Structure formats: C-alpha cells, structure tokens
Amino acid sequence: ATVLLEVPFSARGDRIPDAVAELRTREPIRKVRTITGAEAWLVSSYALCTQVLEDRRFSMKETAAAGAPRLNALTVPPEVVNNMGNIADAGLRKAVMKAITPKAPGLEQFLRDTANSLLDNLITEGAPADLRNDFADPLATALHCKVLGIPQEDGPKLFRSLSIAFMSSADPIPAAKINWDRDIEYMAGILENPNITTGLMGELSRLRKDPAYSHVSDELFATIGVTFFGAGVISTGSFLTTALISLIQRPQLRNLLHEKPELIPAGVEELLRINLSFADGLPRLATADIQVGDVLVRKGELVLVLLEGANFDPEHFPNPGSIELDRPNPTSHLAFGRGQHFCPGSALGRRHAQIGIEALLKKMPGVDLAVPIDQLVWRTRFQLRIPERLPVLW
Amino acid sequence: ATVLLEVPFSARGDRIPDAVAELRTREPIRKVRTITGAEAWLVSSYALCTQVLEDRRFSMKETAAAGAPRLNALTVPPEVVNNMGNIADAGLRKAVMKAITPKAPGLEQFLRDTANSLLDNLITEGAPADLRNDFADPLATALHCKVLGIPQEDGPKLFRSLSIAFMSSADPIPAAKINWDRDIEYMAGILENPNITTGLMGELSRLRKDPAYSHVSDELFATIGVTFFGAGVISTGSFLTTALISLIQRPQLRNLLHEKPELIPAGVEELLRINLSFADGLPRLATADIQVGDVLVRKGELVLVLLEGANFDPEHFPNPGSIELDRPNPTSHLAFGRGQHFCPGSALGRRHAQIGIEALLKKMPGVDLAVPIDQLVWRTRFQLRIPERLPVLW
Ligand code: HEM
Numbered sequence: 188a189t190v191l192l193e194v195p196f197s198a199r200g201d202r203i204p205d206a207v208a209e210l211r212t213r214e215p216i217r218k219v220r221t222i223t224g225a226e227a228w229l230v231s232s233y234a235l236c237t238q239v240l241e242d243r244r245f246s247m248k249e250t251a252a253a254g255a256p257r258l259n260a261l262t263v264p265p266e267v268v269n270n271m272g273n274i275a276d277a278g279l280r281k282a283v284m285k286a287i288t289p290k291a292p293g294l295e296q297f298l299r300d301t302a303n304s305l306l307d308n309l310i311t312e313g314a315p316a317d318l319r320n321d322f323a324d325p326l327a328t329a330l331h332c333k334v335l336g337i338p339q340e341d342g343p344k345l346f347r348s349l350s351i352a353f354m355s356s357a358d359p360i361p362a363a364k365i366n367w368d369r370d371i372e373y374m375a376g377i378l379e380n381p382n383i384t385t386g387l388m389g390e391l392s393r394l395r396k397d398p399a400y401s402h403v404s405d406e407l408f409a410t411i412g413v414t415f416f417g418a419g420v421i422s423t424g425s426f427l428t429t430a431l432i433s434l435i436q437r438p439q440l441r442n443l444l445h446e447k448p449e450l451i452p453a454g455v456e457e458l459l460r461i462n463l464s465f466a467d468g469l470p471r472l473a474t475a476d477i478q479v480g481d482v483l484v485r486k487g488e489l490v491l492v493l494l495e496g497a498n499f500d501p502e503h504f505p506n507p508g509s510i511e512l513d514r515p516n517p518t519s520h521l522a523f524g525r526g527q528h529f530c531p532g533s534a535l536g537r538r539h540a541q542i543g544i545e546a547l548l549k550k551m552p553g554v555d556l557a558v559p560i561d562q563l564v565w566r567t568r569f570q571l572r573i574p575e576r577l578p579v580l581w
Numbered sequence: 582a583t584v585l586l587e588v589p590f591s592a593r594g595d596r597i598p599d600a601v602a603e604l605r606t607r608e609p610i611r612k613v614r615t616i617t618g619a620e621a622w623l624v625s626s627y628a629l630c631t632q633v634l635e636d637r638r639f640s641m642k643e644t645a646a647a648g649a650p651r652l653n654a655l656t657v658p659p660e661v662v663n664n665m666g667n668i669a670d671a672g673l674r675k676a677v678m679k680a681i682t683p684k685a686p687g688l689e690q691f692l693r694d695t696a697n698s699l700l701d702n703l704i705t706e707g708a709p710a711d712l713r714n715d716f717a718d719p720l721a722t723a724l725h726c727k728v729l730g731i732p733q734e735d736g737p738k739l740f741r742s743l744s745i746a747f748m749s750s751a752d753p754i755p756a757a758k759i760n761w762d763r764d765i766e767y768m769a770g771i772l773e774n775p776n777i778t779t780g781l782m783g784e785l786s787r788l789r790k791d792p793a794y795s796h797v798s799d800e801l802f803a804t805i806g807v808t809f810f811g812a813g814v815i816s817t818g819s820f821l822t823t824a825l826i827s828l829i830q831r832p833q834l835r836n837l838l839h840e841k842p843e844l845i846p847a848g849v850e851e852l853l854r855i856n857l858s859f860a861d862g863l864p865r866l867a868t869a870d871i872q873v874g875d876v877l878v879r880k881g882e883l884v885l886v887l888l889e890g891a892n893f894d895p896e897h898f899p900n901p902g903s904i905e906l907d908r909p910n911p912t913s914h915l916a917f918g919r920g921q922h923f924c925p926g927s928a929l930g931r932r933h934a935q936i937g938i939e940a941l942l943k944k945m946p947g948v949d950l951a952v953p954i955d956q957l958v959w960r961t962r963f964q965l966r967i968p969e970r971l972p973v974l975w
C-alpha cells in the first residue's frame with residue numbers, strides 16, 4: 188500500500204521533475220494530498236490549466252472560506268484573499284494598475300542605475316558574490332520602494348517580513364500576523380504622511396481624500412500597499428534569481444544575450460516560460476460541478492493549477508525544456524497566470540528582469556556559478572522556489 | 582530492485598529519523614553510498630562507534646589520500662586534513678589548546694556582555710527575532726575573534742566564508758578555494774601585524790619568532806588561524822542554534838533551567854548528547870583489515886561514524902530521546918568525538934552554549950517559536966544541520 192500522491196513534488200527550482208511529464212501524459216488531472224492533509228485535483232496540461240484559470244466558477248475568493256479543503260494556511264486575513272476584487276469594487280483598479288507599470292518617467296533609469304551600483308559593489312568586493320541576497324532581492328526591493336513612493340531606507344524592514352509572509356505552511360503562522368499588523372500600520376502612516384506624494388502610495392493618498400472614495404476603507408488602502416509591495420518584491424526577486432541560474436547554465440545563451448542585448452526581451456519571455464518560481468499549483472475552489480478532462484470536479488473541491496505543467500507541455504511548446512527565442516507563441520505561457528487573476532505587475536516584472544539581466548551581462552560577462560549546482564540550498568515550505576544563496580564568480 | 586542505502590538520511594536537525602534505531606538494531610555496521618557514489622560502512626551503535634574512533638588504524642589523515650573512496654570533496658588542501666597532527670609535530674599543540682579554553686581572564690564576562698547586548702537589540706526591535714543570524718552566529722563570531730585576538734570588525738567577512746567552507750559536496754567547490762586563499766592571506770597579515778598581541782594569534786605570532794619554532798612554516802601558522810576560527814564558529818553557532826530549538830520545544834525544561842540556572846551545565850550536556858548538528862558520519866579510512874561487529878572492514882575502505890547513532894543508543898543512554906539531567910554517564914556521549922581527534926574546543930563550546938542559554942532565558946523567559954516547527958528551512962549538502970532562520974517570539 189502506498190499513500191495518495193503528495194504535493195508539492197520538489198522544492199528544487201533548477202530542474203523540473205521527470206515525474207511532471209509522466210503525470211501530464213497519464214493523468215493530466217489527478218487527485219493529490221496537500222501539506223494540510225486535504226485532497227485536491229492537480230491539473231498539469233496546458234489545455235486543462237487554461238480551462239480552469241478561465242472559468243471563474245473555479246474561484247480564488249472561495250479558497251478562503253472556512254472549512255474549505257486547503258492547499259496551505261492563510262497568511263493574511265481571509266478577506267484579503269479577494270484583494271483584487273476589493274480594489275475593483277472600490278473603483279481603484281485602473282489607478283492601481285497604472286501606478287505599477289514600468290512607464291513612469293525615470294523608472295527604468297532608476298532600475299538601471301540601481302542594478303549597476305549593486306553590481307559595482309560586488310565587483311569591488313571580489314568574487315564570490317551572492318546574486319540573490321546582494322543583487323536580485325535588493326534590486327526588487329529598491330524598485331518597489333520607488334514604485335510605491337516610499338523611502339528606500341524603509342525597504343529592508345518590509346522585505347524582512349517576506350520569508351514568513353510567503354510561507355506555504357500546514358498551520359497558521361503567528362509571526363505572519365505580527366508582521367502583517369506592523370506592515371499595515373506602516374502603510375497607514377504612509378497614507379497620512381504629507382511627504383509621500385509619488386508612486387502608488389502617493390496616488391492612493393490623494394484618492395483617499397477625494398469625495399469619490401470617501402467610503403473606501405483606510406484598511407483597504409493600507410492593504411493595497413502591503414500586498415503589492417510583498418507580491419511584487421517576492422515575485423521579481425525570486426524570478427530574477429532563478430532566471431539567472433537558467434542563464435548561467437546556458438553559456439551559449441549567456442554569450443548570445445551579451446553580444447545581442449536586443450534579444451534580452453525574447454530571452455526573458457523564455458526564462459519566464461521555463462521558470463519554476465511558483466512552488467505550488469495556483470489554488471481554486473469549485474463553486475459548481477464542472478467537467479475537467481476525465482474528472483467531474485465537485486462543488487467545494489480544491490483544484491491546483493500547476494504552472495510548469497502547462498509551460499513544459501510539449502503539445503503547446505515543442506522541445507519545452509529548451510530556450511528558443513523564435514517560438515511562434517512566445518507570450519502564451521502561464522507564468523503570469525491567466526484569466527480574471529492575471530498578474531497586474533506583468534510589465535513591471537518583465538522590465539525588472541530585462542534590466543537586471545542586461546546590467547549583469549554587461550558588468551559580468553564571465554558570470555558563472557562558484558559552487559556546483561547541487562550545492563544550492565532550496566527554500567522549503569514556501570510559496571516560491573528559491574535558493575537561499577546564489578554564489579557566483581565572473 | 583532498489584539502490585544501495587544512501588547517506589545522509591535527512592538534513593532536518595529537529596528530530597532523528599525512526600530509521601536510525603532500525604539500522605542500529607538490525608545492522609549496526611552496514612554498507613551505504615555517499616554523495617560522491619563511493620561505498621562506505623555506516624556505524625551506528627555506541628559500542629562500534631567507540632571502537633572505530635579509538636582505533637587509529639581507522640585513519641583521519643588517510644581519508645585525504647588521492648583515489649580513496651570519499652564521503653565528500655575536500656574543501657581544504659589535502660595536507661590540512663591532518664591539521665592537528667601538523668600542529669602536534671610543530672610542537673604547538675599545548676599552546677594552541679591553552680589559547681582556546683574558556684579560561685582567559687575576562688572571556689566569560691565578554692561572552693555574557695556580548696550575549697546580553699545582542700538580546701537587548703532583539704528586544705528593542707521587537708518580535709519576531711531570528712536566533713540564528715541575529716544571536717547564535719554573531720555570538721559565536723564575536724567569541725572567536727576574541728579567542729583569536731583579532732579585531733571584532735573582521736569577524737563578519739571571515740564568517741561569510743563558512744556557508745561554503747563547510748559544504749558537503751560531491752565535487753570540488755571553486756569558491757571554497759577562493760575564500761580559503763583569501764582567509765589564509767588575512768591570517769598571514771595578522772601574524773605580521775604588531776597590534777595583534779592577545780589570543781591564539783597573538784601567541785602564535787610570538788612563537789613564530791622564537792628560535793624553537795624557526796622552521797615551522799608560515800603556512801601552518803596561518804592555517805591554524807583559519808581552521809580554528811572556522812571550526813569553532815560553525816560548530817558553536819550551529820550547536821547553540823539547534824540546542825535552542827530543543828529547549829524551546831521543551832517548555833518544562835526551559836522553565837526549569839530558567840528557575841534553576843545552576844542546572845544549565847547538566848542541561849547543556851544533554852543538549853550536546855541529543856544534538857543532530859553533524860550532518861554526516863565522521864569519516865575514517867581503514868589502513869588494515871579490521872573486524873567491526875559482523876563485518877571485516879578491508880584496508881582502503883571508508884567508515885562513517887554516526888554520532889547520533891551512538892548518542893541515541895538505548896543500550897548506553899536509556900530513554901535516549903529524553904533530556905534527563907540526572908544520568909549516571911552524562912559526559913560519555915560522542916558529541917565532541919572520541920580518541921585521537923577528540924574536539925580541542927570542547928570546554929569553550931560548552932561555555933559558549935551555557936552562557937548563551939543562561940542569557941537568553943533571563944532576557945526572554947517566554948521564548949517560543951514564532952512559526953510552526955515544520956516551517957524551518959534545513960540547510961542541505963552541508964557538514965552541519967542548521968535552520969537557515971530561527972524565528973522566535975517571547
Ligand atoms: C516576474 C515576476 C512575477 C511573476 C512571475 C508573477 C506571477 C503571478 C501569478 C502566476 C499570478 C496569478 C495568481 C493566481 O491566479 O492565483 C500573479 C498575480 C498577482 N501578482 Fe504577480 N507576478 C510577478 C510580478 C508581480 C509584480 C511586479 C507585482 C506588483 C507590483 C505583482 C502583483 C501581483 C498581485 C497583487 C497578484 C494577485 C492578482 C489577483 O489576485 O487577481 N506581481 N502574479
């Protein structure tokens with residue numbers, strides 16, 4: 188006798204398990220057990236992943252319901268699971284989205300300057316350098332302070348919540364509430380601070396005092412700041428880190444992008460496609476009985492959309508493990524999700540990675556791992572896959 | 582068909598695998614495969630572990646021989662594997678050992694002051710606190726700068742070598758050589774620096790200019806500094822970290838030691854006994870054919886002495902998983918090894934942990950984990966077991 192197949196499969200973010208292709212072939216929707224002991228349906232083909240993400244009867248909001256089968260414990264108040272819906276209902280969606288594009292004058296130059304300063308510091312200090320803790324994550328943090336309009340010096344403390352806030356735990360996490368409440372208080376203070384006039388928080392601060400938003404709660408305004416800082420920083424820092432591993436392990440590609448930096452956007456799209464940063468499938472709760480492939484999913488059941496299932500599906504992306512800069516369907520990957528909950532930071536995430544990679548290749552064209560790849564330490568029981576340190580030489 | 586049993590079993594340092602007791606019962610010496618692909622004999626009973634450690638025909642030195650079966654790749658030059666032998670041959674053993682006791686006037690007060698300052702800073706900042714990165718490891722680092730006689734401000738850079746220097750890798754690690762060579766250069770400079778007059782390096786600096794040591798190499802003097810700093814810092818920081826987990830998970834014991842701090846030495850001895858800090862068995866190479874239990878170990882074979890095998894052996898320590906402060910054989914554990922290579926820092930390691938625990942319990946009597954214990958992230962492919970962060974509240 189063997190137990191029901193457990194998820195997640197592996198915390199390693201440098202390779203996809205051979206087992207994913209076998210599951211996709213044999214049983215592209217199949218029952219699994221999550222870390223809480225709940226059962227769920229794991230969906231692993233491009234076709235079925237798209238179907239689930241584009242049918243809102245597979246609900247994000249309802250995953251927060253009391254008594255639902257859970258992927259993991261909430262690390263935010265249950266109403267915050269519906270954050271984007273709350274933003275939309277408040278009439279804030281257009282303004283929030285506009286504030287988090289890469290388009291504000293000076294933003295891209297700020298990114299480039301920041302990346303180059305971080306890299307110059309590493310070069311001065313001498314190899315080895317840790318490209319996660321001393322490049323990708325500080326670049327993400329600096330970017331998001333700028334995007335939010337908050338002081339750069341406040342970034343590190345907000346950043347330090349994230350190793351707990353984005354845990355994927357079987358049980359509630361007391362530290363997550365301590366940090367959440369503190370970070371909310373910080374954002375509430377920002378909204379009251381007359382010096383904060385730019386970025387997302389500057390704009391929210393103005394809208395909060397406009398009559399058209401008089402009955403939008405101060406709680407929601409503060410929540411937008413905490414959620415967007417955290418989601419953006421953890422996702423961009425983690426993606427850039429693991430994209431750098433993918434690049435470093437492909438000297439031919441590294442050299443090509445170094446020689447022809449105009450190809451970096453196409454390279455980043457492929458790096459997004461093959462990215463293993465999301466450690467769990469995206470959760471949804473069925474609100475009706477719905478046929479998904481050979482399975483009739485029942486109302487109240489949990490569905491997990493495995494992004495690397497879709498993104499490595501050879502029926503959609505032939506030779507899926509290879510980075511090919513000339514695919515006919517390059518942005519059709521699910522790295523940013525799909526449907527109602529498609530990532531609102533996608534353009535900013537792309538630009539962060541493009542600029543970070545461009546700067547690194549110019550400054551460190553000889554970049555290579557400084558330890559054997561198996562020596563990287565992969566963070567466990569976390570919503571993202573990342574190496575704790577990324578030691579390189581150049 | 583199944584593969585030969587692989588070592589190590591688990592990087593988690595908060596619990597011993599049920600499998601260790603089964604191996605000890607069924608096959609207290611048995612064949613395993615190491616991360617390099619080599620075969621080895623894993624020894625897991627107190628009786629057989631002692632036998633191996635007390636027979637120098639199971640040689641530490643010879644593990645460094647070219648072409649030997651390996652537990653892991655060398656991270657130091659092969660001659661440095663025989664460091665203690667080299668020290669003894671140079672006539673330096675007595676002086677080195679004397680410099681690394683906890684006995685120098687002011688040392689214990691320095692430890693207490695340092696621990697209390699670190700804890701006061703955590704209390705000011707507010708929970709959660711990371712007791713590894715912001716307590717145990719800085720306390721270890723500060724201690725070893727003091728013991729060596731080197732500037733406190735030089736500690737962090739030397740410390741940063743350790744996440745690579747103590748890797749347990751299948752292959753050589755290029756960063757380990759970069760850091761090794763740099764740290765040797767640092768210690769060579771210390772030996773030439775007239776300001777360095779105290780501690781281990783102050784004493785070595787004097788002996789280096791004494792006629793009785795004129796033909797001891799400058800390489801060996803520098804090597805003593807790098808090796809003792811690294812071994813001491815990694816071992817004490819890691820032991821204190823995982824001992825704190827053991828304590829925190831035993832509120833009754835925490836409270837008892839808080840109430841009766843005179844029991845802390847007995848508590849630390851039990852914490853040493855149950856400690857899972859060594860991630861691999863201690864390696865030795867047979868230099869003769871030697872009977873160990875039911876196995877005739879052949880010349881040239883690798884033997885791995887599993888310390889938790891010995892220390893959790895119920896035939897030697899009844900109710901081995903329980904901390905009992907009134908055992909009749911309390912220091913007879915193998916936490917510091919046994920025989921020729923018994924830890925030369927044992928007294929200092931004991932005092933570091935005793936003082937750290939005493940200070941923590943006084944300052945944070947309510948100390949508890951701030952995350953569920955399964956959320957700790959255990960470092961992989963490392964010579965020690967440690968959580969990357971240890972989040973607590975109080
Ligand atoms: C390369 C970096 C990024 C990746 C790979 C990424 C990925 C994703 C994915 C897969 C989702 C969908 C979750 C689901 O459907 O369950 C998502 C949603 C989200 N992303 Fe991103 N993201 C990135 C960057 C950003 C940035 C820069 C921000 C904001 C500054 C951001 C904010 C959000 C938020 C707030 C959501 C939730 C949307 C909702 O619930 O409707 N992300 N992201």
Ligand code: HEM
Pocket residue numbers: 641664665666681808809810812813814816817820858863864915916917918919921922923924925926927929930931
């Ligand atoms: C609680 C903390 C410590 C623990 C648990 C510990 C454990 C051990 C063990 C098990 C060995 C034996 C290795 C073998 O036989 O293969 C050893 C050896 C050694 N220890 Fe420690 N140690 C600690 C603290 C220290 C300190 C504070 C120092 C120096 C300042 C130190 C320096 C060394 C050195 C240099 C060796 C190698 C001895 C040899 O090769 O003969 N250790 N230690």
